[PDB]
Amino acid sequence: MNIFEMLRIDEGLRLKIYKDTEGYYTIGIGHLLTKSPSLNAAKSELDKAIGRNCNGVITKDEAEKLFNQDVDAAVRGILRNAKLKPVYDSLDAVRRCALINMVFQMGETGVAGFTNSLRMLQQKRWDEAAVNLAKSRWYNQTPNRAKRCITTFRTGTWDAYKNL
């Protein structure tokens, strides 16, 4: 189990624009296109992103390309972030994957705002941090994916996905 397989389980693969849990236009493996209500704003964003006229549809290859970009941008984001960097350096390899997973889902800014939880992960207070992360909108909106992620932080194992 690696970060890519893990995100593929959490986000799914969709070769056609779609709407995210939130009402947003997405495509491939959780690639947020726009928070704008236009199917037309989304299709333009998509062609700009892919560099071809897609007409709301893309190939596997294209989706994977977008995926490679996103995880990479998520890693460099954590590495350049003064709030995130220390937590990450402090963690074991499995728990690191869990922070990349949160960061790919909610962005840098989002996760950087989970101050308390960050402070607990850094302190290695596992159970306590698990409980804290659950008290969020993220958990209430997409509970099963949040739970898998929270369990990875709580245990340091890939159990939650081992099922899937």
Q: What are phi and psi of 15, to 5 degrees?
A: -85, 15
Neighbour count for residue 16 (Cβ, 10 Å): 10
Catalytic residue flag (residue 20): yes
Resolution in units of Å: 1.9
20, 47, 64, 128: the active-site residue:
20
Q: Tell me which H or E stretch contains 142.
A: none
10, 11, 62, 108: the active-site residue:
11
Binding site annotation covers 81? Answer: no
Per domain, the residue ranges of the chain are 1-164
Neighbour count for residue 45 (Cβ, 10 Å): 19
Catalytic residue flag (residue 11): yes
Helix axis angle, 3-11 to 60-79, nearest 10°? 120
Neighbour count for residue 59 (Cβ, 10 Å): 13
Binding site annotation covers 67? Answer: no
Q: Which residues contact 29 (CB under 8 A, 6 or more apart)?
A: 7, 8, 11, 12, 13, 14, 63, 64, 66, 67, 70
Q: What kind of architecture, by CATH, is found in domain 1-164?
A: Orthogonal Bundle (1.10)
| Cβ-contact 35, 43 below 8 angstroms | no
CA 120 from chain centre, in angstroms, equals 20
Binding site annotation covers 79? Answer: no
Neighbour count for residue 71 (Cβ, 10 Å): 18
The SS3 of residue 49 is helix
Q: Which of 4, 120, 118, 10 is nearest to 71 (CA)?
A: 4
| Cβ-contact 104, 26 below 8 angstroms | no
Please give the method by which this entry was determined: X-ray
Return the half-sphere exposure (C-beta side, CA atoms, 13 A cut-off) of residue 77.
20
| Cβ-contact 13, 29 below 8 angstroms | yes
Binding site annotation covers 39? Answer: no
Q: Which residues contact 5 (CB under 8 A, 6 or more apart)?
A: 161
Q: Tell me which H or E stretch contains 5.
A: helix 3-11
